[model samples]
Structures are given as C-alpha cells and as structure tokens.
Target: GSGEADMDFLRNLFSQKERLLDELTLEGVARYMQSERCRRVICLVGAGISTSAGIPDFRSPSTGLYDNLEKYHLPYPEAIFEISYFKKHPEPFFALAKELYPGQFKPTICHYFMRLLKDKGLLLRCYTQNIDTLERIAGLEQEDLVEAHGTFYTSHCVSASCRHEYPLSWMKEKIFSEVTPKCEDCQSLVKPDIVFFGESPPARFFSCMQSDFLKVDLLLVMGTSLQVQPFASLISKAPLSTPRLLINKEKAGQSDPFLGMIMGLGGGMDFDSKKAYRDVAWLGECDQGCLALAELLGWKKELEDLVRREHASIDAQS
Candidate 1:
C-alpha cells in the first residue's frame, strides 16, 4: 500500500510537467527570466566563484589551500580550520588569513552578475559557500547574502562568555603585522566569523532557507560542484516548479543511481535523468557562463560595463 502511495505521489508530481520549458537551455532560462513567471531568483554560489579572484579553493590537488598547509606543521591539513586546534594554535590560520584576506582581491564577473540580479530586483537571496567576502565587495548588501561558510568581514573572541565583536580592519592590522589579534575587553583569541570544521553555519543560513526556498521562482547554482552538504542540499529545497540552472566547469549534483531510483527525490540538478525536466546545465567557467546567459538576456553590455568600472576602482585602490 505504501508503494502504491509512493507511485501516486510520483504520478501527481509528474502531472505538472508543463511548468518546465520544453528546451532546458541557457537561452530558455533567459527567456523565462524575461517573462513574468520568473522572479525572486536565488543564487547558490561556492568557492569556484572566488577562484578567479585569486583565492585558492580548499580541495584542488597541488594548489588548494589544504595542500599548502605543511609549513604550518599541523597534524592534518584541515587542522588549520579545526575549532579545537584553532583555540590553541591560532598562528597558522592568521598567517594564511593575511594572504587571503578580502581586500587583496577584486570580485569576479560572476559576482557582478549576482549584483546585477539584485539590481534587477530579481534576487531573493545569495547563499554563498565562499569566505572571501567578494559578494559584499561587488555591491550586494548584507541582507542579500547568507554566507553559508561564514565570512572574514567580522571577527569575534573565541571565548563564548566574552564574545566581543571586532571589525575586519582590527583583525587585518594585527594579522598583517604577524600578531594574533586578541579581544580588547577579555584578551581572548579573536577569530574571524568564518565557520570552522567543527562549528555549525550561522543561524541566518537556516532561517532564510525556511522562507526563501518556498517562493523562489528560479534557482541559479554557479561555480560549485555541490559536493558539500546542507549547502548542497539547498538545490532540493526550491519548489518543484522552479527551474534550476547549473553554470559550472562540469556537471555536478548528479543523483546516485541506486539511491535516486528508490527515493525519487535525491537528485537536485541531474539534467541527464529522465525525471530532470526542469534542470539546465551550462558547463564552463563560471564567468563565461554568466556572460553567455547575460548575452541571451540582452544584458551583456551592462554586465561587462559593471565589471569594467568596478575593476577600475579596485585597481586604483591598489
């Protein structure tokens, strides 16, 4: 009987297949956005969005941040971000932080595209797995983002009781000078708000997801492989009517053959699945994919001009 119920549910879900475009292409996504049906777009971004800004991704073989941690002499590469280890040895993190801090790099074109989405009043929220703070630098307001991996924009004392907040400037001054920042009031270690390996994401991540996904009309997943959890699971949160677009270097979020068949709900962006009627994949560099999509939407010049002006200002600052 339960199997029959499951079949019934699946039948009902498939009955509304007309909601999806017959052709799930970049051009189709653009046309949909141009129409009245697509508004309240939500963007789910990841480290790949920041790689063009010169920040190293965490897992890329020789060049990843994790691979270059040997000089820190940690028990393991991830130890640099482990909460317990950080409480005792904050030097390694600080040393790495000084080099990868936000101001050192400019936001990429992909980031500007998210800002453009906000400018067009279509952005519901941007859930980012990046700690680089480029989204803010690209002109997206604090309210526009749920920094799922936390950020370097602010820091706090490690001591829960004290928990004094410090601005990015405060940490930058001490870190650049090779000094571990401490809380002024309590003299405890001051660490950036970035989520450590053992810590949970900020409350905003959960609170926003509770409301945002239900009404999202379009879901844009850029530059991420969707390998990480909770953040990755967000692809499945949007309403079934929402069109999901993936713009990345490769196809990601494919469902496991065994699990996807039994559950029928596991895969979020598997365009190859017969059931994946609402998904589209535009595989390439994130910026290039955004540019292609922008071109389709007739916003190519605006997007390019934004990047040029912003990059010019960033260059002047340097």
Candidate 2:
C-alpha cells in the first residue's frame, strides 16, 4: 500500500453511491440550494459580514475599528475591552462606543440574504459573532438568531448591583454626549451587554448552539475569521455530513492554526472548488459574495430588490 493512498479517504470515496457533490463552487451550492433536502441551513456570520455596512471589523491593521484607538492613548490596544481597564477608565471605551452604538448603520445586502433564507424557509438559525443587531434589523426573527458575542440590544450597570437592564437608546444618549453612563442606584459604570475581555459568554449561547446544530443539514459560514473560541468551535459542531459553504474576502476561519494546517492543501489563493467545504465557496467581499450566490441561484434581481426595499423602509422610518 503506497503511503500516498489514505484508505480512509479512498474507502469513503468508493462507498458512496450518489455522485460526490460537485466540487465546492457556486454551481455546487446552487444545486444544493434548490434541493428539497437542504431545508435546514445554518449561517455562521461575523464582522466581515457587517463590513459592507460601514462597520469596521476589529483586527485589520490600518482600517479596522481598533486601529485608530491611538487617540484613546491606552497602555495597549486591547485595554479598551479589558474589564479591569474599563473599570479604571471607562471613558475611552464609551468614547469609541459613541460612534458604534448601532442603529446608525443600515444592514448590508448580505444581511438581506439571511432574511431571504428565512423567507424561503431554509434558515434553521444564524449563529452570528457580530454585536450589531443588523440581523434583527434585516428581519431575521429573534428565534432564528443566536448572537454569540451579545449585542447593543440592551445594557446594564456594570457595578453588579443588579441595577436593572437599560434600553439601548439610554446607553446611546450618554455615550453620544461623551458622558459616562452611571447606575443611578449604585453610581457605577453602565456598559452594553457585549462580551468584554474578562467576561464569560452568555449562557443562552451554550444551550442553544448544542441543541440547534444537531440536525443542521447545511452550514453557510460567512465573513468570519473564526479567531475567537466557542464561536469558532461552532463550525466543527455541525454534523460531518453537513455541507459547509464559506463566503468572505479570504478563507473564513484562517485565524485558527488548524485551518492554516489545510491552507496549502487547497489550490491557489483564488476560488478552488477542489478544497474542503470549510475553505472556500465564494471568496470576495460580503456584499459581492452574497450577490454572486444570488446570481448563481437566479435570485439576483429578487435579492437586489429586497435590499433596496429594506433600506428604503429603514430610511423612511428613521
């Protein structure tokens, strides 16, 4: 037996009766999308998905949200999120939060794509790492979303007095005015429910993810680095037979060493259908990626119209 032959790979290859699905390409995803058996599609979304809406992601060196924090003049870049640091100096964090408290930016076209999935009755759940409640704004029902990192949906007094949760509008008012919000009762800082560096993940994240992913038939992983834990682990949590599709500027999950493990194994940096599902599907910006998929599925016009309609409605309401 030549070492070149991985029998586990070969045995699995020969044992299947149906044609192995087409290499992971738009055409392949299209075929599956139109199939009846693909009713349950789970979406793993992250910051990359929101970048198109003018929301800056956290990690890119120059353009990311964290890059300009030099003005904050903290001891280090991550000081803004450290719970201990926040306790000492909450001003800088609130300063940054003033610009990023959501409601200002509209959900991107890709967000509408998730809505499309739900409208078509194909989305089982969207496991999003983004704190922006864009999915909700885009009309993906609360029951279908699991905001892994929390959201600006509500806030609380960080003084731990159980000072009662406050509405997002309240947080925004103080943050926008360069005023540090305080708990009227305890007189301590008030912060959004986002998972800070020292915080634990929400309990609902654990409970829902385990049970919801159990029966997922297809996974659409979009715009994520999968750098962070627990949320990153959600990718592997899907059933092995579940088909995974990635849509992002680069390969999703590359932040994980395990993913880089399989990097060279995939063909050229561009689109490679021969690679594993986790590696590639649509490699481009989030908006274009979702649009490309809609084009492949012959839903481009419908998707375009929906994005326009949603943006218009949001504008009118505002």
Candidate 3:
C-alpha cells in the first residue's frame, strides 16, 4: 500500500506542469523580465552575436571559418584548434589569430543588451562560447562571465611546469608581426587560453555551474546551433521551471529522434513538445532579435544609445 501510494505521488508530480510563463513570446519574455520572478537571468551566447561585428562564425557552410581554412593546409579545419597541432604547427593558428584578434572588432548590439541587463541588475551571468573577449569590452566584469570556450584576454606557455602567463598586448605584438610567441622564461610556445580540441574548459566553468544554474530564473540562448557537447548540454542544466528563450536564425538543440527514443533523453529546446512548456523561439538575426526584445521591454532607446556611445568611444580610440 505504501509503494502504491508513492507511485501515485510520483505520477502526480510528473504529470503536473511547471511552466512559469503563460505565453511563449518575446513580449512574454520581456514582461517576465520586468517582474520580480525574472531576476537572475543567465545568457548563453555564441559566435552569431559577434558576426555583425565582422567576426565570422565557425560553422556557417561556405562562409564559415572552418570552410575557409583551406589556406592553412591542415589535414582538417578543426586541426587549427587542436592542441597537438598548435604545439607543432603554431603558425596556422597565429596567422589566423592576427586577423581575428580582439581589438580589431567591436561589440554588437546583442553584447550591449547583455550589458544593459547587468545595468538593470537582472544579469546573473553571460555564459559565452566565444573567445573574442567582446563581453569584457562591453563593460561586463570577470564576475559577470563564464567564457566557456576560454579567451584571448590571456595567454600561457605550453610547458607544463613553466606555464608563464602573458597579457593580450604582449601576444598581439608577436602575432601581428608574424612571429610565433614563446615564453620568455621557458622558451616554449605560447597560446591563448582558448579551449583547443584536446583541452578541457576552464575550472571556473565547472565551479560556477554548481551554483549559477540553481538560481537562474530566465535562460536566454542566443546565436548558437548547440552542436558542441558540454556547452550544448548547458541548455538542460537550468531548473525545469526556468523559462528558456531562444533568439537565433534557426531552432537548435533539438535531440535527434532516434537518439531521444533510444537514450530516453528529453529533447532540448524542442518547443513543439508538450513538455517544453517553458520554451520560446524567436527566429531571426541575433542583433534584430535582441532589438525586438529590447523594444518589448521599453529599453530599445537605452540599448541603442549604449551601442552608439560605446562604438563612438572605440572609434575615437583608433
């Protein structure tokens, strides 16, 4: 009788809907953010956010960075990011790095929206898959970020024992001059903190997730296809009751039908599913999607003003 009672209780709990938002729309998300329940919003962003700023995304067919890697003459395009490849052949990565370095690009409107969230005190953290360091340039501090893919803000020697750290400026000088940077102390190759194919993410990525997800009331997934593992899995890490809004050119993170059936894993961001009551999709360019959301939230002017001012300052510096 106790077992039967417990089974009924479990069934009731599983059957109960836990969605906080009544409608899944950009306006709905904006209204939710205006409410007290929407504090501590976490932004999960990708390269699409920076594309408008002149940086190319990694996987966009013919135009993507991967597709254009033929000039590097690597066995494969991804080898440019592979740790083993970089150790022996640092030229390719550095050659690419010289062109794509941080200072050359400006933060897009989407980046400013994140900064606006911080200004409004709703930003829990911006978990970025980009190594471009634009979030930092947007006025977000180290505490406000989880740079999941590592960053170009810092570099280190490849030697295990002599892991000497170098600042961005130091590495930039060497890279721009077509010289492979080496650690002054140990004479080993230096590489940016980017999470290469063979390496793991920063330790903070794991530590921060333990506490960050528990309090996340709103999850904003922007511009990523969610193809990569670990980072893709983050969409599922937030509490089931949290509202997740996707702003991108396409729907992403859906589980393969066969994989979902065999593994019994719930489809991620599958807004069509009855269980995805808290999911919303606004398909479009990341910047335009952000502008639409800002318009609904009554922050369109503020967001645009911020971008205008920041860009002016950046141009002045040049």
In candidate 1, residue 225 scores what lDDT?
71
Q: Candidate 2: where are CA atoms >4 Å away? A: 1-23, 57-73, 159-163, 226-232, 252-280
lDDT of each: 0.83, 0.75, 0.83
lDDT of 1 by residue, 144-240 (tens): 9998768888889988799899988888889889899988898999999989998876777778977888888989999887555655567777787
Q: List the candidates' TM-scores in order.
A: 0.86, 0.78, 0.85
Poorly placed runs, candidate 1 (over 4 Å): 1-18, 57-72, 253-264
For model 2, what is the error of residue 274's alpha carbon versus the real structure, in angstroms, after optimal superposition? 7.8
lDDT of 3 by residue, 1-318 (tens): 659989998888744137688788888888888888888999999888988988865455655344334566998878888999999888888877875678878999999999999999989999887888899999999889998778888899988899899998899999888888999998999999888999877778877876788778999989877554555567667788889888889865446776445323643565766655788889999999999999999998999999999999999998
lDDT of 2 at 65: 57
Q: List the residue pairs that clash in candidate 2.
A: none
Winner by TM-score between candidate 3 and candidate 1:
1
lDDT of 2 by residue, 1-318 (tens): 675569778777643113224655767877877877677988888889888788864555666355446666899878888889999998888877866777779999999999999998998889888877899889987688888767777788886547477887888888877788888878888898877889776677767776777777777878875445555556666665566777878754355466555434422122344534433467789888888888888889999999999899989998
